[PDB]
RNA sequence: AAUAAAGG
């Protein structure tokens, strides 16, 4: 009796961790390779349109990247990336220029239990270093085994392992390792400390750290020591290799700065003055400086200077003052600027600097000069929304009054993002809600065109209809112009603008006519054997296609339309075509003109104009292959557009039977043919239930892009960065006609038909940004946000936040406060103060003067929206906001707490209509560590007991307690049950009885496990418990009394596992859209992604399991990793699919789909039914 | 001198070593730190009284758990030498068994007397908890094994050996256990019935330690016998898998590590030995430095290479596996011999019960002390 | 997540069926034990099957004052103790240290001073 | 009630 489920990645993670600057694509330009957990982004630095970074490529892995390096091999024409994955995996990959993807050059597994020396748990991450002269690489695996990989003058050789502790001067506890600059042989400088100590034991032992220079001879596997030093300060943190011609290392310790070299006494300098009685090293004070160098990032921006990002944000510029022979004499600090909490840092082109951050938005900065001072300027920022510490689910404020009266609810996710000076609230929605400015009722009409007439504001709304048409004047008020030069007599097949909007062309199934306002200039009748059915305008060309397959071209020569017949004599009937006015520079063999044509015999072709010359052909087009290549199923539509900055990135959209296909053009290179190929793009758009379904707009709110109409409508947007954004819009129904619009009521807006015969003139709600994986609004708090709680009846957000101050006192046993008194150069402690704010979803600005400050040293350990019984509401319950507080003085003070029940009320004021009503605030006889509700009671966790309180007449009244585990830190209830979570024991299932007033332990997981959070997998008449652990694993346990190993029911049996690959700290869950009482269970990971588990049937689970095995064994994967060993724990039960792999079936041609479904036995229609139904069921937010 | 709990003593501000501030600090560091490569270093200064995380907060430094700071000494009023000390599974409190057969229950936060019970009719020698935290199992001198519940109630008392039982341990499923005796045999028992499955008759005399394995079915024993000091057993079968000639004196204790790869043993020839449980032909390493015998050993419950030991002279030393020389220690911790050690389930307090009639509490050091 | 969006009230669970019927339950292996157990429903409605050795808490008598050892979790007379195992601070015993002398040393004294 | 006060 198990529970099956799919996993899905509802939002890719955002926080970046590594950055590098290398020749990724080729040896012409260099560009920025940044990484994340399981993600890789190659950005191209622009200098126009004002610097911005254009996303050039993006890849994802079945493995969390643990390190990254670059190398320039022997005969290669680009740099190879050496990536490092879990416990030992060194994978060397490269760029594939003929397919625009990432090829795996080699894969190295160094995972054998002989290498662990006994220890089962691994705490020593892989660390990959590369020699500056690209002559070898090193990888420190398991904290002991130094793997050496030479490169050839196949550019690879047999790697070999070294016992780093077998060397003379046995190494232990390695801190960090580097290669030096300026040696005839490669040389690894290792910083370690043989005799380890603790900041509580520096009185007993110090001067522990040492360094060694291991000169690696790769030709005959010899590696002696050349120089070592000992007794260095106990808390050395980092090593920095100093480029030539200075040439040494710079070693950071928490309180000092050291420079080391050959034949040079260690030049050390103490920065703050906590080096008193903790080092016997000779440290000379640094005068006008008082800082600490832990958790600091550093990079050299010249041979002499370097930049340092401290633990708090401040950016300094260190200069290595030298003698006449570049022997570092003294140092110089200089506080340049302040910035974000970096997590990496790299120097780009001279003048630029990328500060990578997983705690806030990554920043590209610029530095100019003015012995030198550098000022910094934020040039650009990459959005980040992690770590997602907590998440509330609240409803948006305004919804256009037509979109109400709808069954599906309208929801919104507020998330506690960032840390420190960078703590914000991220508001996320998934769809788009068009702000409906006005509505009409025009039944009968089935198509429209919005054309500019006489500064690019739209004139006539050329509508269309069955037998006749209709035209609206639309300058100030939407008024039906009648009796005009246009053709109202028949059904219009096209309408546009030619000659920089100076003209109009209305194409009808009898001829074409060109206009100049209301009056027509010219009309030429078109008869060729068949009626017109297709028309495509690229200024100054017009190409019209017939209902049978003839083609004819027009242009505007100096003033009406001129006839021309294209010499495309061929034996295959034509089905579709389009024109393309290229402003970019990619289509070569400055604007040019291109005609993309599709025939009946499968083929596709691309002609240049006006000559109608062949430059590119594809044999088997409608199948949907993955790279379109120049060769020497009912295709319904085809559209080729240029997007990005200044029309830089061309895509090809295709509507084939029930399928959407998206290609992006990339360059490549018979002879005399188009130098372009077309790589397929993955997506999740569903076309399942002669007018165009693709609608190009530019500047609908400031954005260029396309609208994909149909049963599942979508917005395809691209911005200054070439990041493609695919946003749903299904609040209205299935859209079936669209038009970009610009008036005095809808300035930079749009208008569209739905399928109830209604026009809607609308604009984009101008408070979210649409250049993000989801539409997001960031809200900076300048502090740290811990807990967020949407209070319902008030529609407000209660937010518990903190801020750091210096520290002055020290508590004692009768609670003396021994005041701290040090010299001037003393780095004070840090001390948090909490505040509980209100935030309004209307302006997303904090309500003025409704803020609860809390007593000094009083941390808040929890804040929830609990619904407690009361004789004032209909449903007998009502929601409050409760927060439990721990007053943590120190280790030697009996930690107490306090419970704080607030309400949010309505008062006579704009924003000041809401205030806190502190209904209860009282000290409890122990720490308060988590709380929830259970049928109207406040379930509090005080110390090591769990109490169930009743708030009557505004005073808490005990009713039951129970004795529990070490430290409860999470509790979640459902329907009389409670589920407690502990910090070293896994979980316990509890219960309450209104009648006898008795808690009771239903059962428990007797094994040990370090939980982060816990929730419920709700299924039809079943209930699992979803747990996430310290090891990035989700796990579903159940209560099965008749299971013969759930003995008396007194155990929880792990009925499913899954290795998500990321820490999850918060869950929530929503119903569906076979799915009767199944709930989707969502969560947010501490890396900035969103995910979901969906409960399934077994019948479907087995089919999709067969498919999953076939996909993982029959396809190649990026960097060779396999998606089976990546979803394993650390006994294993694995009743959970992958979801991120099943969607790869959607990315296969129909030939390959048929092959694989036959090698399983099933039918690709049934496969796609399962997959796409799982997709449409989880379409929320 | 009677102490019935009715004497009206004035208040006392008890010397406390609390863990809740440190745990709260750790829960707040989780959300914005990957691991200890994202940790801002604690300073050795007296004002950083809030920047301490528990042993789980840092796994790149086991040195923190070297508890050489005295806290509190817990002596009864009618003194007896202490034989075995065990934290209840949730760290709620601490239990001491002494040579009078009494259980003395001490608090685990302020360390004060809570209660006392007359448990055995004989010096209590063995005390251990099941892996599910439900059953406590005790053994006295020259006699019985008794079953205890979490509230310290006695549900079943059963004669096992005609002579003194020295140690015990549970099966990973807690359904069957072992007892080694002064009769030179190891008897393997069923639990729900008090039924004896096997008798193990390999030793020469006075099996004085036994221990099951966390996953496998192999039971280790250790004796006075200079000819077969350490032996292996298969419980269902009852056959000596191997024999281990490691110590030439009565091997006091024997400990299998939770990763299932390591054995550690301690003997009256001043030494402790770590053995790789699969390759028994050699000695994985020899922990030297004890001016007299070694009598008690205990692995740390969070860190995998850290353990503590105490000898016949009052010393208690702290050792780490990959490390050669002694890591830390306290020379005159007691006056008599340390009989039993116990780490706190969380790993920050160490209790040591000795032959000088007391039991002392040790904790981690404070930043920037004297 | 909220009681408005995802409302599991119209549903019955496997738990709620295997809890109020005591489905997986074996009798006690030793006589005399049961704090942290269900107040037996069958014994309330006079249908207790396990016969005195029921694995869940029997409530035979009526009791008046809170059990002094139960508050610390050390009561051995469970299911047969003379004193309530209920957390009702209005039915707590009287302070010895106040009733005899006249000055309690516990600032947070849970015992009824009077 | 079976040590609530076990800093005697
Ligand atoms: Zn009953
Ligand atoms: Zn009782
Ligand atoms: Zn009192």
């Amino acid at each position: 009796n198990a529970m099956y489920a799919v996993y899905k990645q509802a939002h890719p993670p955002t926080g970046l961790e590594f950055s590098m600057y290398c020749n990724f694509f080729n040896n012409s330009e260099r560009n920025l390779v940044v990484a994340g957990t399981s993600q890789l982004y190659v950005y191209r630095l622009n200098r126009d349109a004002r610097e911005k970074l254009e996303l050039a490529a993006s890849f994802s892995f079945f493995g969390n990247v643990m390190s990254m390096a670059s190398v320039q091999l022997a005969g290669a024409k680009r740099d190879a990336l050496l990536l490092s994955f879990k416990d030992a995996k060194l994978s060397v990959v490269e760029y594939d220029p003929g397919t625009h993807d990432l090829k795996t050059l080699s894969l190295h597994y160094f995972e054998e239990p002989e290498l662990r020396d006994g220890f089962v748990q691994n705490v020593h991450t892989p660390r990959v270093r590369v020699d500056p002269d690209g002559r070898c690489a090193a990888m420190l695996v398991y904290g002991t085994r130094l793997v050496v990989l030479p490169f050839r003058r196949s550019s690879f050789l047999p790697s070999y392992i070294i016992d780093v502790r077998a060397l003379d001067e046995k190494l232990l506890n390695i801190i960090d390792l580097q290669f030096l600059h300026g040696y005839y042989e490669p040389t690894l400088l290792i910083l370690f400390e043989p005799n380890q100590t603790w900041p509580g034991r520096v009185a007993v032992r110090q001067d522990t750290c040492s360094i060694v220079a291991i000169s690696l001879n790769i030709t005959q596997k010899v590696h002696p020591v050349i120089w070592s030093l000992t007794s260095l300060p106990f808390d050395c943190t980092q090593a920095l290799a100093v480029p030539k011609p200075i040439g040494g290392v710079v070693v950071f310790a928490v309180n000092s700065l050291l420079y080391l070299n050959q034949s040079v006494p260690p030049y050390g300098v103490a920065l703050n003055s906590l080096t008193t009685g903790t080092t016997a090293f000779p440290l000379r004070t640094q005068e006008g400086v008082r800082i600490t160098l832990d958790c600091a990032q550093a990079t050299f921006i010249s041979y002499d200077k370097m930049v340092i990002s401290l633990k708090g944000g401040e950016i300094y510029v260190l200069t290595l003052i030298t003698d006449g022979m570049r022997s570092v004499r003294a140092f110089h600090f200089d506080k340049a600027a302040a910035s974000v909490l970096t997590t990496s840092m790299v120097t780009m082109e001279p003048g630029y600097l990328f500060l990578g951050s997983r705690l806030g938005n990554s920043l590209l900065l610029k530095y100019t000069e003015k012995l030198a001072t550098y000022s910094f300027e934020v040039c650009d920022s990459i959005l980040n929304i992690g770590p997602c510490a907590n998440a509330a689910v609240g409803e948006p404020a305004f919804l256009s009054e037509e979109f109400q009266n709808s069954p599906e609810p309208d929801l919104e996710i507020v998330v506690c993002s960032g840390h420190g000076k960078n703590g914000a609230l991220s508001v996320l929605q998934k769809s788009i809600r068009p702000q409906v400015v006005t509505t009409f009722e025009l039944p009968g009409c089935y198509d429209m065109w919005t054309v500019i007439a006489p500064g690019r504001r739209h004139g006539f709304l050329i509508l269309s209809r069955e037998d006749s048409t209709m035209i609206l004047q639309t300058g100030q008020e939407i008024m039906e112009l009648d009796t005009s030069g246009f053709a109202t007599q028949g059904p219009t097949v096209f309408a546009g603008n030619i000659g920089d909007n100076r003209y109009i062309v209305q194409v009808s199934p009898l001829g074409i006519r060109l206009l100049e306002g209301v009056n027509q200039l010219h009309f030429i009748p078109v008869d060729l054997g068949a009626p017109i059915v297709q028309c495509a305008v690229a200024d100054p060309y017009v190409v019209i296609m017939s209902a049978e397959g003839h083609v004819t071209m027009f242009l505007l020569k100096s003033h009406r339309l001129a006839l021309h017949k294209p010499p495309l004599h061929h034996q295959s009937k034509v089905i579709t075509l389009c024109l393309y006015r290229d402003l970019s520079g990619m289509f070569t063999t400055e604007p040019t003109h291109w005609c993309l044509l599709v025939r009946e015999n499968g083929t596709m072709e691309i002609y240049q104009l006006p000559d109608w010359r062949l430059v590119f052909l594809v044999k088997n087009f409608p199948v949907g292959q993955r790279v379109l290549v120049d060769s020497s199923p009912l295709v319904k539509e085809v559209l080729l557009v240029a997007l990005g900055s200044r029309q830089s990135r061309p895509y090809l959209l295709v509507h084939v039977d029930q399928e959407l296909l998206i290609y992006e053009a990339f360059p490549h290179d018979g002879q005399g043919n188009l130098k372009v190929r077309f790589k397929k793009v993955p997506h999740n758009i569903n076309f399942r239930e002669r007018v165009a379904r693709f609608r190009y707009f530019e500047d609908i709110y400031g954005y260029s892009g396309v609208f994909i109409c149909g049963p599942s409508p979508h917005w395809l947007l691209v911005t200054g960065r070439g990041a493609l954004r695919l946003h749903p819009m299904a609040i209205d129904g299935p859209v079936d006609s669209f038009a970009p619009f610009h008036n005095v009521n809808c300035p930079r807006g749009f208008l569209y038909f739905n399928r109830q015969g209604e026009l809607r003139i609308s604009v984009l709600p101008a408070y979210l940004s649409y250049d993000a994986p989801w539409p997001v609004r960031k809200i900076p708090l300048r502090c740290t946000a811990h807990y967020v709680a949407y209070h319902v009846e008030s529609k407000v957000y209660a937010v518990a936040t903190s801020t750091n101050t210096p520290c002055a006192r020290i508590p004692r046993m009768e609670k003396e406060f021994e005041t701290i008194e040090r010299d001037e150069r003393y780095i004070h402690p840090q001390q948090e103060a909490f505040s509980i704010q209100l935030i309004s979803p209307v302006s997303w600005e904090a309500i003025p003067n409704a803020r609860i400050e809390l007593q000094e040293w009083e941390h808040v350990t929890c804040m929830k929206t609990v619904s407690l019984r009361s004789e004032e509401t209909v449903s007998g319950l009502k929601g409050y906001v409760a927060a439990g507080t721990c007053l943590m003085q120190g280790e030697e003070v009996t930690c107490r707490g306090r419970i704080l029940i607030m309400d949010v009320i309505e008062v006579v004021p704009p924003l000041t209509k809401n205030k806190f009503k502190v209904l209860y605030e009282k000290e409890q006889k122990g720490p308060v560590t988590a709380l929830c509700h259970c049928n109207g009671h406040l379930v509090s966790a005080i110390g090591q007991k769990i109490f169930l309180w009743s708030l009557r007449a505004s005073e808490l009244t005990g009713m039951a307690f129970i004795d529990t585990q070490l430290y409860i830190h999470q509790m979640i209830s459902v329907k009389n049950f409670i589920l407690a979570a502990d910090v070293m024991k896994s979980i316990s299932l509890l219960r309450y009885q209104e009648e006898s007033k008795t808690l009771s332990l239903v059962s428990r997981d007797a094994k040990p496990l370090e939980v982060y959070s816990v929730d419920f997998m709700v299924d039809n008449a079943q209930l699992g418990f979803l747990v996430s652990d310290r090891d990035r694993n989700l796990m579903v346990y159940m209560y099965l009394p008749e299971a013969k190993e759930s003995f008396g029911g007194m155990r929880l049996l792990r009925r499913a596992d899954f290795h998500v690959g990321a820490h999850v700290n918060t869950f929530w869950r929503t119903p569906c859209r076979v799915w009767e009482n199944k709930h989707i269970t969502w969560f947010a990971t501490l890396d900035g992604g969103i995910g979901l588990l969906l409960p399934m049937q077994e019948k479907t689970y087995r089919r999709l399991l067969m498919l999953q095995n076939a996909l993982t064994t029959m396809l190649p994967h990026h960097a060779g990793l396999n998606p089976r060993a990546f979803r394993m724990l650390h006994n294993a039960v694995r009743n959970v699919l992958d979801g991120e792999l099943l969607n790869r079936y959607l990315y296969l041609s129909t030939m390959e789909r048929s092959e694989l479904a036959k090698k399983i036995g099933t039918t690709p229609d049934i496969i796609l039914d399962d997959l796409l139904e799982t997709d449409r069921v989880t379409a929320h937010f | 001198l009677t102490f019935d709990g009715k004497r009206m003593r004035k208040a006392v501000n008890r010397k406390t070593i609390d863990y809740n501030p440190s745990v709260i600090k750790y829960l707040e560091n989780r959300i914005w730190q990957r691991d200890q490569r994202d940790m801002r270093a604690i300073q050795p200064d007296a004002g950083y009284y809030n920047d301490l995380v528990p042993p789980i907060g840092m796994l790149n430094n086991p040195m923190n758990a070297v508890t050489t700071k005295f806290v509190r000494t817990s002596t009864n009023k009618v003194k007896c030498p202490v034989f075995v000390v065990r934290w209840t599974p949730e760290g709620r409190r601490l239990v001491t068994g002494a040579s009078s057969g009494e259980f003395t229950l001490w608090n685990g936060l302020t360390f004060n007397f809570e209660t006392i019970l007359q448990a055995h009719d004989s010096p209590v020698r063995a005390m251990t908890w099941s892996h599910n935290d439900m059953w406590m199992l005790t053994a006295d001198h020259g006699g019985y094994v008794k079953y205890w519940q979490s509230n310290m109630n006695n549900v079943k008392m059963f004669q096992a050996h005609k002579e003194a039982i020295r140690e015990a341990s549970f099966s990973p499923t807690d359904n069957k256990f072992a007892t080694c005796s002064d009769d030179g045999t190891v008897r393997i028992w069923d639990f729900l019935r008090c039924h004896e499955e096997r008798i193990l008759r390999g030793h020469g005399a006075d099996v004085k330690c036994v221990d099951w394995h966390p996953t496998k079915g192999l039971v280790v024993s250790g004796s006075k016998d200079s000819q077969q000091p350490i032996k292996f057993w298969d419980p269902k079968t009852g056959q000596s898998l191997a024999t281990l000639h490691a110590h030439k004196n009565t091997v006091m204790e024997v400990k299998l590590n939770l990763n299932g790869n390591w054995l550690l043993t301690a003997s009256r020839d001043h030494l402790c030995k770590l053995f790789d449980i699969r390759n028994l032909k050699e000695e994985l390493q020899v922990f030297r430095g004890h001016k007299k015998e070694a009598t008690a050993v205990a692995w740390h419950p969070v860190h995998e290479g850290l353990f503590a030991s105490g000898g016949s002279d009052g010393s208690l030393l702290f050792w780490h596996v990959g490390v050669e020389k002694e890591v830390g220690g306290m020379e005159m911790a007691h006056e008599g011999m340390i009989w039993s050690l116990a780490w706190h389930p969380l790993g920050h307090i160490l209790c040591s019960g000795s032959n000088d009639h007391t039991s002392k509490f040790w904790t981690r050091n404070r930043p920037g002390d004297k | 997540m909220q009681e408005i969006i995802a409302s599991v009230d119209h549903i019955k669970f496997d738990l709620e069926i295997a809890v109020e019927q005591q489905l997986g339950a074996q009798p006690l292996p030793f006589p005399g034990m049961k704090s942290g157990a269900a107040v037996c429903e069958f014994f309330l409605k006079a249908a207790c099957g396990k016969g005195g050795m029921c694995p869940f808490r029997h409530i035979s008598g009526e009791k008046t004052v809170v059990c002094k050892h139960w508050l610390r979790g050390l009561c051995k007379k469970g299911d047969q103790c003379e004193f309530l195992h209920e957390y009702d601070m209005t039915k707590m015993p009287e302070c010895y240290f106040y009733s005899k002398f006249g000055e309690c040393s516990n600032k947070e004294c849970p015992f009824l001073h009077i």
Side-chain angles (χ1 to χ4, degrees), chain C residues 9 13 15-16 21 28 31 36 66 75-76 78 83 97-98 113:
Chain C
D9 285 330
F13 283 140
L15 279 75
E16 188 183 3
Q21 292 175 357
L28 294 175
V66 174
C75 188
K76 301 174 179 67
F83 299 103
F97 294 96
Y98 185 84
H113 286 87

Side-chain angles (χ1 to χ4, degrees), chain A residues 1053-1124:
Chain A
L1053 297 177
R1054 177 182 292 173
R1055 292 304 194 195
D1057 71 1
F1058 189 73
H1059 179 76
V1060 182
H1063 294 101
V1064 177
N1065 196 358
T1066 186
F1067 289 99
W1068 67 93
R1069 67 183 183 274
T1070 57
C1072 298
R1073 294 285 291 278
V1074 180
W1075 293 272
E1076 183 65 28
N1077 286 315
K1078 297 177 181 177
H1079 284 88
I1080 309 165
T1081 291
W1082 301 82
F1083 57 78
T1085 72
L1086 295 175
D1087 286 323
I1090 297 168
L1092 62 95
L1093 262 73
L1094 178 68
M1096 300 177 75
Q1097 305 291 109
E1098 179 185 358
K1099 298 289 184 182
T1100 300
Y1101 175 76
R1102 297 296 175 190
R1103 291 193 299 272
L1104 294 174
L1105 181 58
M1106 293 188 284
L1107 178 63
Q1108 181 176 355
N1109 289 313
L1111 288 171
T1112 181
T1113 61
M1114 293 180 185
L1115 275 61
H1117 296 286
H1118 286 94
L1121 303 172
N1122 58 354
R1124 176 178 284 120

Side-chain angles (χ1 to χ4, degrees), chain A residues 1010-1025:
Chain A
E1010 180 180 356
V1011 172
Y1012 283 9
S1013 185
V1014 67
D1015 196 353
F1016 295 102
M1017 282 291 296
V1018 171
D1019 188 348
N1020 198 4
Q1022 290 185 354
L1023 183 68
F1025 314 112

Side-chain angles (χ1 to χ4, degrees), chain B residues 38-71:
Chain B
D38 287 333
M39 189 177 73
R40 284 88 173 98
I42 304 168
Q43 302 291 325
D45 186 74
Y48 294 84
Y49 56 92
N50 275 323
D51 293 331
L52 280 174
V53 295
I56 59 178
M58 45 187 166
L59 298 176
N60 279 319
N61 200 358
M63 292 295 297
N64 61 358
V66 174
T67 67
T68 59
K69 178 180 175 181
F70 178 66
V71 173

Side-chain angles (χ1 to χ4, degrees), chain A residues 51 67 103 183 205 315 355 432 434 487 630 717 1000 1009 1120 1169:
Chain A
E51 289 84 1
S67 182
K103 179 175 184 174
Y183 279 154
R205 182 179 293 174
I315 296 171
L355 299 185
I432 310 296
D630 179 74
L717 297 170
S1000 65
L1009 181 67
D1169 289 331

Side-chain angles (χ1 to χ4, degrees), chain C residues 95 97-98 104 106 109 111 113:
Chain C
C95 187
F97 294 96
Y98 185 84
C104 181
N106 287 116
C109 182
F111 292 86
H113 286 87

Side-chain angles (χ1 to χ4, degrees), chain C residues 22 40-43 48-50 54-58:
Chain C
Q22 189 182 3
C40 184
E41 302 90 0
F42 297 150
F43 177 71
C48 184
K50 302 289 188 178
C54 187
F56 298 95
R57 198 159 70 89
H58 280 168

